[PDB]
């Protein structure tokens, strides 16, 4: 029953805490927590490849893609491993994150421990935007806050 946690920080006011739980090996992962300081609405939410914070969130590299697929939404088969879709901030700017995903893992080749969770400035178009960038990042915009994913239990 592996457990992980991530403290999202950035230059601006967006900040949060996101926990992860995987009861069985290679089974679904629960992702739950809270982000704040966001504009109301949808915000891209991804696991990026590197747990490098030397030059801010930019050092995290691209979306975690150990299978070298194209960007999509979490429900699509063609997707990055770290494509977690969008989180929703209310009028107050608080996104209550509740997600269940079977592509990310806390072990094996799809392990995200030691990589970087990142919340984005705008919505992820899930790869349906009809342009090249949509097949890469989903046009979610700049990185508002991020953090290395660490072992919790």
């Amino acid at each position: 029953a592996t457990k992980a946690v991530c403290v999202l920080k950035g230059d601006g006011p967006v900040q949060g805490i996101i926990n992860f739980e995987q009861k069985e090996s290679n089974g679904p992962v629960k992702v739950w927590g809270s982000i704040k300081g966001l504009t109301e609405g949808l915000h891209g939410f991804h696991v990026h490849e590197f747990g490098d914070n030397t030059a801010g969130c930019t050092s995290a590299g691209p979306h975690f893609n150990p299978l070298s697929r194209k960007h999509g939404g979490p429900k699509d088969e063609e997707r990055h491993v770290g494509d977690l879709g969008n989180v929703t901030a209310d009028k107050d700017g608080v996104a209550d994150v509740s997600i269940e995903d079977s592509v990310i893992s806390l072990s094996g080749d799809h392990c995200i421990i030691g990589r970087t969770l990142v919340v984005h400035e705008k919505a992820d178009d899930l790869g349906k935007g009809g342009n090249e960038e949509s097949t890469k990042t989903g046009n979610a915009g700049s990185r508002l806050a991020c953090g290395v994913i660490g072992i919790a239990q």
Partner: nanobody, 115 residues
Framework: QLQESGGGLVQPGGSLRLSCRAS????????MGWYRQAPGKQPELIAT?????????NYADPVKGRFTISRNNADNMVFLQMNNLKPEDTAVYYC?????????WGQGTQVTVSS
């Protein structure tokens, strides 16, 4: 829930401004797109607007540089300004959310380009 208007017949090179009134619950996700749909085909996403403030727009390749998407937060409305229209643009246009579960489609508005 979603109500589009502003379409019609326009000669090649002309222009149009589609409008859509969306419910406040759908608008408040601040991820709105215009899709175009040809007969028998699936609706493709054509323009997106998301983020705070006045919003930020992104465009699919066949319309980039000719179409602009915008929104009015107070009126909960979305707009597609289409310029330099071509026959390939002929389609029924719909406005919906994106980046999440699609809401029930509206009636859309037909756009025909021909001289």
């Amino acid at each position: 829930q979603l109500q589009e208007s502003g379409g019609g017949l326009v000669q090649p090179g002309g222009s149009l401004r589609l409008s859509c009134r969306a419910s406040e619950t759908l608008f408040s996700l601040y991820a709105m797109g215009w899709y175009r749909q040809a007969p028998g085909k699936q609706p493709e996403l054509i323009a997106t607007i998301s983020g705070g403030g006045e919003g930020t727009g992104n465009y699919a390749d066949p319309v980039k540089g000719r179409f602009t998407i915008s929104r009015n937060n107070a009126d909960n409305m979305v707009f597609l300004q289409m310029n330099n229209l071509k026959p390939e643009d002929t389609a029924v246009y719909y406005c919906n959310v994106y980046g999440t579960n699609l809401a029930p489609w509206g009636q859309g508005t037909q756009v025909t380009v021909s001289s």
